[PDB]
Tab-separated table of C-alpha atoms in Angstrom:
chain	number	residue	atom	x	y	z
S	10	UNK	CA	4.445	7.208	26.826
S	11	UNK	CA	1.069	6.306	28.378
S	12	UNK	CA	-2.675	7.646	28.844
S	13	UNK	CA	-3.865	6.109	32.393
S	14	UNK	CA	-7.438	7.264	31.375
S	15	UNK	CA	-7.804	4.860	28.086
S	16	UNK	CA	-5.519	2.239	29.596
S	17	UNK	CA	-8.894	1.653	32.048
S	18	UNK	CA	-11.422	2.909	29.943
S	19	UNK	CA	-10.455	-0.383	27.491
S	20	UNK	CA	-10.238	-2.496	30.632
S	21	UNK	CA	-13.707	-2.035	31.344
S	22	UNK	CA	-14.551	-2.472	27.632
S	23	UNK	CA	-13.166	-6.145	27.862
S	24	UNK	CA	-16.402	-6.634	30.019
S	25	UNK	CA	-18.763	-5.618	27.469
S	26	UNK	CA	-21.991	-7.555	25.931
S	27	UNK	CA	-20.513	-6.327	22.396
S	28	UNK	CA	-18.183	-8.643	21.103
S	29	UNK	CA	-16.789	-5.740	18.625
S	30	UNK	CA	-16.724	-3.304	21.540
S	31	UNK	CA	-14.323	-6.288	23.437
S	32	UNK	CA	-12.424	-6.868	20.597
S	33	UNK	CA	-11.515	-2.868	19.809
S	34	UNK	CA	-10.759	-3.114	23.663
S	35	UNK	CA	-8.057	-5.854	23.233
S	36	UNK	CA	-6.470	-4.687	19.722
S	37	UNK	CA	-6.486	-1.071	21.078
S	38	UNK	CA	-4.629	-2.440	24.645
S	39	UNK	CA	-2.027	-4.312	22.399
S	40	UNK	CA	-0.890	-1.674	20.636
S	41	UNK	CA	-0.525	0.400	24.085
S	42	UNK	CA	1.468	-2.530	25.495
S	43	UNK	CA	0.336	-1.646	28.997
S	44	UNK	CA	1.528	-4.002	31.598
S	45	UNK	CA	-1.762	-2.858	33.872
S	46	UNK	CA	-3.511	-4.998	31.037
S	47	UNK	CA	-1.934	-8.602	31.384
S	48	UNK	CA	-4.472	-10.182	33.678
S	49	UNK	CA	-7.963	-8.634	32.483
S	50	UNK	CA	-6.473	-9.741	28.647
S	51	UNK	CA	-5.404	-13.514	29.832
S	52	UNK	CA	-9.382	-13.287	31.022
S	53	UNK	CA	-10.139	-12.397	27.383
S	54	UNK	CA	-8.270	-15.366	26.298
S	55	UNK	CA	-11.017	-17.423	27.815
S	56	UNK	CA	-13.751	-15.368	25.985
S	57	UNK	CA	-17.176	-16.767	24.490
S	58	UNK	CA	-15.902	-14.981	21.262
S	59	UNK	CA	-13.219	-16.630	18.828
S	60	UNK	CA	-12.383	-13.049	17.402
S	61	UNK	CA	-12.127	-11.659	21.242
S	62	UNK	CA	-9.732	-14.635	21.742
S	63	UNK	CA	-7.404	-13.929	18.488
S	64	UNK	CA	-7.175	-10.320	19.608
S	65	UNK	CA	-6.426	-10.814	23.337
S	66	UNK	CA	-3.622	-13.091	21.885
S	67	UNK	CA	-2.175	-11.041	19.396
S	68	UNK	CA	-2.312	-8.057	22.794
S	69	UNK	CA	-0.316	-10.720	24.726
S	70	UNK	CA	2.466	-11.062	22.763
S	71	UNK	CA	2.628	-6.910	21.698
S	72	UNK	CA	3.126	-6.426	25.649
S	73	UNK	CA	5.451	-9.414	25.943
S	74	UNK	CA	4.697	-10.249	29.791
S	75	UNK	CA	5.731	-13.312	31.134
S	76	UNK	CA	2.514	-13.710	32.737
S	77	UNK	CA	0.804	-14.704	29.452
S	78	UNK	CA	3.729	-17.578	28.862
S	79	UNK	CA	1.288	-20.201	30.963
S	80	UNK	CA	-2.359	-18.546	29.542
S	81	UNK	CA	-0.619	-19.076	25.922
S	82	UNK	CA	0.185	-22.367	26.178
S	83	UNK	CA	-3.183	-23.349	27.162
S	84	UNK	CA	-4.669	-21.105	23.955
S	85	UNK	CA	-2.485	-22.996	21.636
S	86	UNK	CA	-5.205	-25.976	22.223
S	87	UNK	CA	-8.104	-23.642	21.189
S	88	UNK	CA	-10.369	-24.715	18.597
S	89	UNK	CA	-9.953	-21.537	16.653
S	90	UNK	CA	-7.036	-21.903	14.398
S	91	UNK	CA	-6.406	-18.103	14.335
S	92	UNK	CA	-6.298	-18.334	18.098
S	93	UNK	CA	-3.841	-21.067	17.960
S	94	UNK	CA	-1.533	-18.913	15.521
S	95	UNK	CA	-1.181	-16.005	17.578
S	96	UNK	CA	-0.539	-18.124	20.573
S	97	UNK	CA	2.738	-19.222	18.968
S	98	UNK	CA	3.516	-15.893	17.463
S	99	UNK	CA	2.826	-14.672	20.503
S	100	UNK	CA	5.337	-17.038	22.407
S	101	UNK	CA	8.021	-16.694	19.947
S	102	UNK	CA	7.547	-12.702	20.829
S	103	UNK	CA	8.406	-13.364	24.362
S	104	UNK	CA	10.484	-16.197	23.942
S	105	UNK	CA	10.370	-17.833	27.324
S	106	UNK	CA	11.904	-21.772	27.013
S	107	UNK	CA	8.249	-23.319	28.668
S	108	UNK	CA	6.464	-22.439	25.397
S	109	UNK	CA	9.337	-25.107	23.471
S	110	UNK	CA	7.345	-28.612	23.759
S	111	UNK	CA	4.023	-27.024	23.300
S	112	UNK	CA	5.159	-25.576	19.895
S	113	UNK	CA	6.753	-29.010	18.497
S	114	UNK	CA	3.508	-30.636	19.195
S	115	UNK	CA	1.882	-27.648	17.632
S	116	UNK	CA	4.185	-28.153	14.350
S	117	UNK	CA	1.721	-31.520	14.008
S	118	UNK	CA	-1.585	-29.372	14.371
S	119	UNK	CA	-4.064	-30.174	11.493
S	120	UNK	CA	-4.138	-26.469	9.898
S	121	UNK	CA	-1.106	-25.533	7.654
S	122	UNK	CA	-1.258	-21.878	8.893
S	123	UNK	CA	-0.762	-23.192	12.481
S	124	UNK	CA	2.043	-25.238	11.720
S	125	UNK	CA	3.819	-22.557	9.518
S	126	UNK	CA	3.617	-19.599	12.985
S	127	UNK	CA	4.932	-22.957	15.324
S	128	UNK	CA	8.181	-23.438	13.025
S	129	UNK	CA	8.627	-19.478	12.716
S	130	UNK	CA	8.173	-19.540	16.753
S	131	UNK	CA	10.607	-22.372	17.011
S	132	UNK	CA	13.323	-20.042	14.955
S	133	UNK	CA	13.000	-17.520	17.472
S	134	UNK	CA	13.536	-19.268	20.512
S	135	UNK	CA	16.363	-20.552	19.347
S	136	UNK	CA	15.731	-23.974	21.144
S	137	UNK	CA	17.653	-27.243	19.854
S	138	UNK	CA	14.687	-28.934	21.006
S	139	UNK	CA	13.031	-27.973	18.045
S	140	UNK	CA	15.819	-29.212	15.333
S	141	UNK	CA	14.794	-32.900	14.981
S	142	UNK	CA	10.616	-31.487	14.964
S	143	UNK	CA	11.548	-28.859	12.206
S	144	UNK	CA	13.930	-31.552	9.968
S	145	UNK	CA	10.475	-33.828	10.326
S	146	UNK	CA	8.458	-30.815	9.472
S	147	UNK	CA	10.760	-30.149	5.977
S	148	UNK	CA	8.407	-33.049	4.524
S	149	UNK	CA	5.478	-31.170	5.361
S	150	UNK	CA	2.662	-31.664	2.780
S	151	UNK	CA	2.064	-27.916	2.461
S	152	UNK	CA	5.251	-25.684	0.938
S	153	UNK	CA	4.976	-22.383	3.396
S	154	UNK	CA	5.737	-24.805	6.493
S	155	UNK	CA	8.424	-26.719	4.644
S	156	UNK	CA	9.996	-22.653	3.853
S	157	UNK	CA	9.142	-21.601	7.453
S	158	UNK	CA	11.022	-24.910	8.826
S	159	UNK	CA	14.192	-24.486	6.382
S	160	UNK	CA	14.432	-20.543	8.067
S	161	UNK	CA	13.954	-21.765	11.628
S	162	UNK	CA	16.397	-24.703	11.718
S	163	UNK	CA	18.810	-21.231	9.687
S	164	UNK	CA	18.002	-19.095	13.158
S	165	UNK	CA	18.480	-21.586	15.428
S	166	UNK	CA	22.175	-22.186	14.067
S	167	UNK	CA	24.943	-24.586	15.863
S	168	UNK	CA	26.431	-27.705	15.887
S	169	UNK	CA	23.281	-30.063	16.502
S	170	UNK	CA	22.018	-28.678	13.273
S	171	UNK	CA	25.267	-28.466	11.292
S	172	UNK	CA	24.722	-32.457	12.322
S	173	UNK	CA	21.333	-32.968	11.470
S	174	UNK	CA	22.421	-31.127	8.003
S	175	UNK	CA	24.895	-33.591	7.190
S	176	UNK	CA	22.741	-36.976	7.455
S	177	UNK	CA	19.471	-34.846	5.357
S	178	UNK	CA	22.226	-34.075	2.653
S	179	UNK	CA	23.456	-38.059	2.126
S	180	UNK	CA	19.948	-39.770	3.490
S	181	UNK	CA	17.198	-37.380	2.310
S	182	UNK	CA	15.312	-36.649	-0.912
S	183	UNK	CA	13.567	-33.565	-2.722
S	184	UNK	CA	13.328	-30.164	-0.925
S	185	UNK	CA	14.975	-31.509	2.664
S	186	UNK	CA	17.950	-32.850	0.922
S	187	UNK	CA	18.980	-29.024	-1.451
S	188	UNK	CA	18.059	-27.163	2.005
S	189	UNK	CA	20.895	-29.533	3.962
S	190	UNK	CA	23.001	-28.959	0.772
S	191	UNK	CA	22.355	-25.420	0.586
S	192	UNK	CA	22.880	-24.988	4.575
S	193	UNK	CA	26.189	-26.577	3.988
S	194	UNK	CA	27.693	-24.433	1.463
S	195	UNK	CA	26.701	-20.999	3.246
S	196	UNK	CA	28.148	-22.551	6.926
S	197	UNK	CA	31.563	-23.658	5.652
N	43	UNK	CA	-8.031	2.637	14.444
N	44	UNK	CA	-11.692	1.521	14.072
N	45	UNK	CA	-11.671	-2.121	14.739
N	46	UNK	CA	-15.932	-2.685	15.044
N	47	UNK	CA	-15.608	-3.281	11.396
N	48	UNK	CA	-13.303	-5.757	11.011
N	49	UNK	CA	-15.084	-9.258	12.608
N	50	UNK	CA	-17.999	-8.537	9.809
N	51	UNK	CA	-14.928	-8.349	6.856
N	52	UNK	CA	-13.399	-11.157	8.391
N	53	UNK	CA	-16.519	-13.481	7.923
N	54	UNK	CA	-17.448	-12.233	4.602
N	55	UNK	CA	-14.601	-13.522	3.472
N	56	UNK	CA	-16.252	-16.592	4.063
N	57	UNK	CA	-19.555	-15.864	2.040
N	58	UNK	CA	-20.510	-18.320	-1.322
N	59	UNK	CA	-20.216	-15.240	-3.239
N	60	UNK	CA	-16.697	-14.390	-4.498
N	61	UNK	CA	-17.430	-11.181	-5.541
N	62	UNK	CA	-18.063	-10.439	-1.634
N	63	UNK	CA	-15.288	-12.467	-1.182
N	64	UNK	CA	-13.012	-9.739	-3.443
N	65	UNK	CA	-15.061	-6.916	-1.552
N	66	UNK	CA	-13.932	-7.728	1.623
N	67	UNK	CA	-10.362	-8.480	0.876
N	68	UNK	CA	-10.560	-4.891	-0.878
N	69	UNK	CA	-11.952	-3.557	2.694
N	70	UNK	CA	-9.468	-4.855	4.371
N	71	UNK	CA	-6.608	-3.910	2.500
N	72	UNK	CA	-7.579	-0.333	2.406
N	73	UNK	CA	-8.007	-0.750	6.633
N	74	UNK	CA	-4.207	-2.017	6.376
N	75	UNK	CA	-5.181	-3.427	9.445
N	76	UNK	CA	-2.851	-6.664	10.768
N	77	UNK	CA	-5.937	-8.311	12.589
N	78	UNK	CA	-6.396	-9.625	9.237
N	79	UNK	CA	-3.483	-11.089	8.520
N	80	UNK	CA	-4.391	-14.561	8.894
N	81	UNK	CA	-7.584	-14.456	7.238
N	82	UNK	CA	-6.378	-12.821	4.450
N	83	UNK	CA	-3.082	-15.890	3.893
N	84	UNK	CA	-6.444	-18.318	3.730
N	85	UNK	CA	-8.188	-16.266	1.598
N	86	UNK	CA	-4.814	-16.862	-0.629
N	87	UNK	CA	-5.951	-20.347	-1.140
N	88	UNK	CA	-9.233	-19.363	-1.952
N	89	UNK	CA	-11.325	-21.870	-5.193
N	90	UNK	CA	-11.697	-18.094	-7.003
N	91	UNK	CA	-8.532	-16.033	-8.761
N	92	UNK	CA	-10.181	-13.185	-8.651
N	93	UNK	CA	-10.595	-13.725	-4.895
N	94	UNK	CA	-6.940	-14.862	-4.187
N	95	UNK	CA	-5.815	-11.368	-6.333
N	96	UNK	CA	-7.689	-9.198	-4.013
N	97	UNK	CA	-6.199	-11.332	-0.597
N	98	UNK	CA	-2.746	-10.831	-2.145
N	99	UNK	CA	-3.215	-7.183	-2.778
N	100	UNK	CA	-4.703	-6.455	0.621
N	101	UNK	CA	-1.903	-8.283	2.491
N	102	UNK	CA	0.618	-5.959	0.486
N	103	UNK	CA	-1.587	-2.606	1.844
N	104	UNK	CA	-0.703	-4.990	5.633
N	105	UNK	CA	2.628	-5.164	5.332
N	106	UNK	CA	2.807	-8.012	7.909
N	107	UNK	CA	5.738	-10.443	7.636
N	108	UNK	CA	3.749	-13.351	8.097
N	109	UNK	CA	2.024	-13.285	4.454
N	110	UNK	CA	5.823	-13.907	3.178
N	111	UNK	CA	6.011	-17.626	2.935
N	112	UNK	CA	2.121	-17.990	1.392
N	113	UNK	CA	2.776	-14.838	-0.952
N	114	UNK	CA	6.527	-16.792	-2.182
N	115	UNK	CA	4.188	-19.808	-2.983
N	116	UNK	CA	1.297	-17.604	-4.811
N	117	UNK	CA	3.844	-16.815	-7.392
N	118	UNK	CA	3.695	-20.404	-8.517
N	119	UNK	CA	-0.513	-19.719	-8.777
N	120	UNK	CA	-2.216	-21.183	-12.125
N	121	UNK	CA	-3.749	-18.163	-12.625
N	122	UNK	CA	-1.036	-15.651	-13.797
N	123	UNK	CA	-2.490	-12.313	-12.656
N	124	UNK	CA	-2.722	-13.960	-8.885
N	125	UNK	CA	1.316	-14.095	-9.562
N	126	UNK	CA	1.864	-10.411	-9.996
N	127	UNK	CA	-0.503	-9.409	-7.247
N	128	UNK	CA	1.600	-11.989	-5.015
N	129	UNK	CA	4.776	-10.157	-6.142
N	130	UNK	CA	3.302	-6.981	-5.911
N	131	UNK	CA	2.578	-7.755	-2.122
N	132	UNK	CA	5.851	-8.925	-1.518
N	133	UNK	CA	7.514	-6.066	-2.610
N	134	UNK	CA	5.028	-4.026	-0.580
N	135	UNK	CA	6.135	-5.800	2.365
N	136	UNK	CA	10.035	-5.518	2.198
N	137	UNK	CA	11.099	-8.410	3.475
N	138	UNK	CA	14.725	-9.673	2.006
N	139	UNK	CA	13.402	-13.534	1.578
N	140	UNK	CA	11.283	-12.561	-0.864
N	141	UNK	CA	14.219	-11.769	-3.365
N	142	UNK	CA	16.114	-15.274	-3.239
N	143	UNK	CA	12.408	-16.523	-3.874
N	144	UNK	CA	12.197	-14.408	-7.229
N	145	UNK	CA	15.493	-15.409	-8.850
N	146	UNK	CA	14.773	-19.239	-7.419
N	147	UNK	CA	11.005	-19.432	-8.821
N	148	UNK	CA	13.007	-18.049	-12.119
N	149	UNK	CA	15.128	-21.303	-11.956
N	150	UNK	CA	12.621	-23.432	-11.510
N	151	UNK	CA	10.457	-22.533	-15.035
N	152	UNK	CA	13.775	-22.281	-17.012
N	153	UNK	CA	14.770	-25.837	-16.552
């Protein structure tokens, strides 16, 4: 169920000299998950504004368009981190395969919160790209990421983890090795 | 809802004063408005308790799924009213993770 009125009425807003005028615009066009709103929000992405950006991203992902997959990517190098985490919430939402090497290199992103929405991305893609990324990010320095990585690497599921399981349970120490042991007993 | 608000609360949370700080996390809670979310997990790690209580509370009000992990590790929070507030949040939020978390951060202080 749509309103074709407000669908371009927020459009137009995204144009705006008010940042918080733009920024209603985008949360408000998320929520409708238009498709008519794709390109005008991937412009939004690009915005002066680091809380127009976060909101055009978190929009993206609500609509789940393909379109944004490419636009995403590029927002996951944004020097906002908030931008960065909806970026990879975003592309875990939509779960298209070309979002896969962007995320493990945004598992080694400076913020914690970044790294903990790339692992939770990661998890539901479902890639096995990401198993040796998320076994290196179970010695993350922060403990949400190091949680975050354990449940991906759960969701992702298989052999090639099974695998990866067994050498963290004889080789590894501390948290890595009881998550490998732990993975073990519930898999058998 | 209206979102014109939410920038300003978003940057207060920001401001030298933690009682502003607390105010704002309050705001936001009572918005229950996700375009907080992230804000709010950083306010969880916050210098100020009193701060960190109010960022707990507000992302229970949220009920966003991505406060889980941070909330899990706020129950292990030197200041023991931050740990019911994290708990309180959790619960809030309804995710299942949360309850292997309880009865494993039990474990943990028994031994």
């Amino acid at each position: 169920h749509t309103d074709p009125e407000k669908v371009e009425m927020y459009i137009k807003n995204l144009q705006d000299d008010s940042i918080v005028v733009r920024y209603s615009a985008a949360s408000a066009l998320g929520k409708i998950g238009d498709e008519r709103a794709v390109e005008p929000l991937i412009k939004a992405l690009k915005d002066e504004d680091g809380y127009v950006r976060q909101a055009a991203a978190l929009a993206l992902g609500q609509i789940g368009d393909e379109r944004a997959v490419e636009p995403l990517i590029k927002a996951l190098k944004d020097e906002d981190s908030t931008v960065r985490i909806r970026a990879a919430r975003a592309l875990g939402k939509i779960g298209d395969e070309r979002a896969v090497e962007p995320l493990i290199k945004a598992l080694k992103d400076e913020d914690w919160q970044v790294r903990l929405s790339a692992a939770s991305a990661l998890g539901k893609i479902g890639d096995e790209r990401a198993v040796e990324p998320l076994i290196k990010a179970l010695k993350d320095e922060d403990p949400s990421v190091r949680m975050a990585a354990a449940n991906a690497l759960g969701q992702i599921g298989g052999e090639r983890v099974r695998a990866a399981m067994e050498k963290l349970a004889e080789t590894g120490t501390g948290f890595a090795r009881k998550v490998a042991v732990n993975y073990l007993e519930t898999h058998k | 809802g209206d979102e014109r608000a939410v920038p300003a609360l978003i940057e207060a949370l920001k401001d030298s004063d933690p009682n502003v700080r607390a105010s704002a996390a309050d705001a936001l809670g009572k918005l229950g408005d996700p375009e907080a979310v992230e804000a709010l997990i950083y306010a969880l790690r916050d210098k100020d308790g009193y701060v960190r209580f109010s960022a707990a509370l507000a992302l229970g009000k949220i009920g966003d799924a991505a406060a889980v992990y941070p909330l899990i590790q706020a129950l292990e929070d030197e200041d023991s009213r931050v740990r019911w507030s994290a708990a309180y949040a959790l619960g809030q939020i309804g995710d299942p993770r949360a309850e292997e978390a309880l009865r494993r951060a039990r474990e943990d202080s028994d031994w």
